[PDB]
Amino acid sequence: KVIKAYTTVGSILKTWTHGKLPKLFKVIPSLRNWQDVIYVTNPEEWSPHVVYEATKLFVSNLTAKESQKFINLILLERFRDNIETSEDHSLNYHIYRAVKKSLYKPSAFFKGFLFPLVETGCNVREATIAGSVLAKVSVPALHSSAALSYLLRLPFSPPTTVFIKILLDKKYALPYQTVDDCVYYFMRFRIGEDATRVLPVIWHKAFLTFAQRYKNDITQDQRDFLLETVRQRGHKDIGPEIRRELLAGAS
Amino acid sequence: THKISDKYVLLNCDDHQGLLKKMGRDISEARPDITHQCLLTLLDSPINKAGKLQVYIQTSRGILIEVNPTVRIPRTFKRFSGLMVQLLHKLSIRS
Amino acid sequence: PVLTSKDKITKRMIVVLAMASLETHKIDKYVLLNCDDHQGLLKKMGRDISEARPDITHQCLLTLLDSPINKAGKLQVYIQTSRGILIEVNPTVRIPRTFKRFSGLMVQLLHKLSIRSVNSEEKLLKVIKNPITDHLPTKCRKVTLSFDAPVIRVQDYIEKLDDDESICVFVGAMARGKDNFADEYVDEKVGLSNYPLSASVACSKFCHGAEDAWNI
Amino acid sequence: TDRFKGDDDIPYKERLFER
Amino acid sequence: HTLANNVESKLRDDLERLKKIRAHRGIRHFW
Amino acid sequence: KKTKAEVMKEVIAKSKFYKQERQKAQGIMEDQIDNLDDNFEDVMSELMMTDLDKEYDIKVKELQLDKRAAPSDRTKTEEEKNAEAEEKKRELEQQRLDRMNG
Amino acid sequence: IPTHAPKYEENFNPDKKSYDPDRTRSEINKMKAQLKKERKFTMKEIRKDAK
RNA sequence: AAGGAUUGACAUUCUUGAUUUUGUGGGUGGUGGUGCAUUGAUGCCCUUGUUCUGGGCCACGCGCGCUACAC
């Protein structure tokens, strides 16, 4: 059995407000039984303050395995319960700054939150919220490139399109792998998903914000299939500006 | 001026329903706003700045007030109301 | 002979109460910004302490009710706010006298956005769009009220302009500052008398110049 | 010298007391 | 300076003691 | 009575929040002083002593090996360039005029 | 013409005295008035019950 | 720049590892309201919101005398 003051810890951390932390729950990294002891605290109840400081300590002791241990079982879905139960869909500043303290360790943050957020239950409104809180703060650059790679090789969902759209108005300095990833994104949307889907203004603005300055590793056959891209997908807001970036880009 | 029980006010057409009707008078005759906006006009006129004017007023209750050219009458209304309360009860206002 | 902006032939005197300050706020309830009634709201908004005054345009009711040219009909009042908003008034509105009823007439700026009468045939107050020059008469004089401009008698100034079809005067109804001279319409500024006049007495001096020029 | 600038506000007793 | 204050407070404690020795009141009369 | 209602209800819920926060801080202090190093009894009895991830790490290492860049910072029109050019010209010309005049 | 600003207190009351900004001279004036009325009432009452 | 960046600190001394660190520059920052069908680059106002410390009550009047205050 465990030493079992965790009834008292759970009772105070249900409606914790302000102050200092129990130091067994501060040095819960350096004891070998952290998941097996939170499995008997069972904090389905939560305070948002202890969400924030607990994910601070959880970043202080998260790897791939530890991120699978705590964040991919109950805390990500607790964030999901918060967004569905918030009736005006007001995910709090508590939860947001918990995510911003959570975003630090980039070792397996993909499997930490971006792998299980494309599981189910991700609508376009939760998607633009998650892309907003991603575009707010500091990011790993090479893992942003790798993220664009795997989320573009992932199946087609408008949450993933607004995700990748925010990751491309990040205004990066693009590697060859991601430039080839975007030209096979055009090869992915063809007559692909032109007869099986139609793509309105949101998809339009996504690839227009790609073509704004994401053209500096593009040769002339790539210019040609972007030319027939806009020739196939002719909207009203394409002509002068995408012709301008076609005459603006280089090799 | 008038008492509230704790507070003194200057009788408006708008600070009361029927304080004037309890005093007997009618509410249409309790208009200090128009002598306020006359006093503003006379003391912002250029003849007052040039020093060829002085402004006497006389209340319907028979009280004569001499108004210096050098005065800065306050621009909003209830500041002038709080000025008129102390003028009517202390009979004098310094700079 | 009532005067709207849509008969730009005839002789008018247009007053433009420029750079006004009447601004709405949300407290369930709706207030508008006075320096006197609330200062902590000004400090929390971070505004300047002094220029939250609609008392100036409420005192400039007197050009709307400057009777011997308004009872002749030949005057028209426009207002342009620091919020860029142009409010027409009709030359037969009997404006609310007290500032609390003028405070209550914030429905033009918030809710109703154009008021009718009780019989509701002719519109009184309007929230029209800029510029002013398009709503002015065809020929129109180019005058703002500054202080350090050359001073002239407005009798002689209106008289020497034989038939310029109107006379428009941009008066800055602000507490302190400087009005938009080179920004919109006025290339020359006419100064009134040798002292720093307020907006109300500037409008009244020009209105009485119009009276004794055009023979009331 | 007050060229239309208006005479200034004077702080209330409770505002000066809260100090 | 504050000597006036303290001799005055003891004076009115003397006076209230004096009143309560007899049968007096505070301000209670009727117009 | 309205102001007394507001003041009384706010003071009541404020004292409730103060009592609850003092109770939670006291619970944290007592649970610390009875479970910080008093868990050294249970520290020894009960103890406990990736293909897609490798694909993502492979893409990260490949971008770390070879990458490229993005032109310059923005995308906008020459009409906006002429607008900003006339704006900078008007600002600097009026600023030089103000410096001449004073 | 020069233009002075008028000095006056806000929320004036004649029945209350003026708010002196010294709490040790307004206090002595308050307690001087207090001893005068209580001394006058006290010795009035003791001379009339002596009568 | 592990021959050490930053993270968790058992008050000084060890359990995290390139998220680096510093400059040179530089994108404004969207958990927003308001017609349209109930997801639709939509005219028109905002960006830089969490935790403790909040109070005066419903020097009395009148009056005679005296004293101040005036080239």
DSSP per-residue string spanning F66-99: S----SSS----HHHHHHHHHHHHHHHHHHHHHH
Closest approach of chain B CAs to the CA of D17, in angstroms? Answer: 20
Between helix A93-102 and helix A76-85 the angle, nearest 10°, is: 160
This structure's resolution (angstroms)?
Answer: 3.2
The three-class DSSP label of residue C14 is: strand
β-strands C12-20, C75-81: how paired? parallel
d(CA F11, CA A95): 29
- Tell me which amino acid residue E24 is: H
Q: Is C3 left (phi over 0), alpha (psi -120 to 50) or beta?
A: beta
Chain E residues with beta carbon closer than 8 angstroms to that of G34: 12
Chain B residues with beta carbon closer than 8 angstroms to that of C97: 33-34
Nucleotide nearest to G26 (CA to C1'): H59
Residue C144 near residue C187 (C-beta atoms within 8 A): no
d(CA C6, CA B11): 44
E near C: at least 3 beta-carbon pairs less than 8 Å apart: no
C22 annotated as ligand-binding: no
- Compute the count of residue pairs across chains B and D with CB atoms less than 8 Å apart: 8
DSSP code for E23 = T
Residues whose CB is less than 8 angstroms from the CB of residue C112 and which lie 6 or more positions away in sequence, other chains included: none
**Nearest-CA neighbor of D6 among C48, C22, B9, B35?**
C48
**Nearest-CA neighbor of A211 among A177, A240, A236?**
A240
CA to C1' distance (Å), from A94 to H29? 19
**Nearest-CA neighbor of A182 among A172, A194, A195?**
A172
B near D: at least 3 beta-carbon pairs less than 8 Å apart: yes
Nucleotide nearest to A94 (CA to C1'): H50
C194 annotated as ligand-binding: yes
d(CA C95, CA A95): 53
Between helix A239-248 and helix A220-232 the angle, nearest 10°, is: 170
Chain C residues with beta carbon closer than 8 angstroms to that of D6: 35, 50, 53, 175
Name the token pair of C9.
């032939």
Residue C2 near residue C71 (C-beta atoms within 8 A): no
The set of long-range contacts for C109-112, using a CB threshold of 8 Å and a minimum separation of 24, is: C109/C22, C109/C24, C109/C32, C109/C85, C110/C24, C110/C30, C111/C30
C48 annotated as ligand-binding: no
User: Distance from first CA to last CA of chain C, Å, rounded?
Assistant: 15
For chain G, counts of helices (H) and of strands (E): 1, 0
Name the token pair of C134.
């398009």
d(CA A152, CA A145): 11
Nucleotide nearest to A128 (CA to C1'): H31
F near E: at least 3 beta-carbon pairs less than 8 Å apart: no
- Where are any strands of DSSP class E within C21-129? 24-26, 30-32, 75-81, 86-89, 125-126
Name the token pair of A103.
């975003």
b/e map C28-62, b = 16+ CB within 10 Å? eeeebbbbbebbeebeeeeeeebbbbbbbbbbbbb
CA to C1' distance (Å), from D13 to H63? 35
Closest approach of chain E CAs to the CA of G39, in angstroms? Answer: 7
Chain B residues with beta carbon closer than 8 angstroms to that of D12: none
- Tell me which amino acid residue A216 is: N
D-contacting residues of G 4-43, CB under 8 Å?
Answer: 5-6, 10, 19
The range of the structural domain enclosing residue A74 comes to 44-182
Could you give the residue ranges of the DSSP H alpha helices within chain A? Answer: 6-14, 34-41, 48-60, 64-70, 76-85, 93-102, 109, 124-136, 141-153, 158-168, 176-188, 201-211, 220-232, 239-248
Name the token pair of E25.
């009141």
d(CA A243, CA A221): 15
CA to C1' distance (Å), from A58 to H14? 19
Name the token pair of F76.
């906008």
CA to C1' distance (Å), from G17 to H64? 25
D-contacting residues of C 32-71, CB under 8 Å?
Answer: 35-36, 39, 50, 53
Name the token pair of F47.
């103890």
Nucleotide nearest to F18 (CA to C1'): H52
Asked if B69 and G1 come within 8 Å (Cβ–Cβ), the reply is yes
H15 C1' closest Cα residue: A30
Residues whose CB is less than 8 angstroms from the CB of residue G7 and which lie 6 or more positions away in sequence, other chains included: B93, B94, B95
d(CA B92, CA B79): 16
Asked if D6 and B44 come within 8 Å (Cβ–Cβ), the reply is no
d(CA F87, CA A154): 46
**Nearest-CA neighbor of B11 among B26, C37, C95?**
B26
Q: Does G22 touch chain B (CB under 8 A)?
A: no
d(CA A165, CA A176): 18
CA to C1' distance (Å), from A53 to H14? 22
β-strands C166-172, C12-20: how paired? parallel
Q: Which of F67, F73, F81 to mutate to test the interface with A (most CBs of A within 10 A)?
A: F67
d(CA B72, CA B90): 19
d(CA C210, CA C153): 11
- Where are any strands of DSSP class E within B11-92? 55-58, 64-67
Residue A75 near residue A112 (C-beta atoms within 8 A): no
β-strands C143-151, C166-172: how paired? parallel
Peptide bond into G2 cis (omega under 30): no
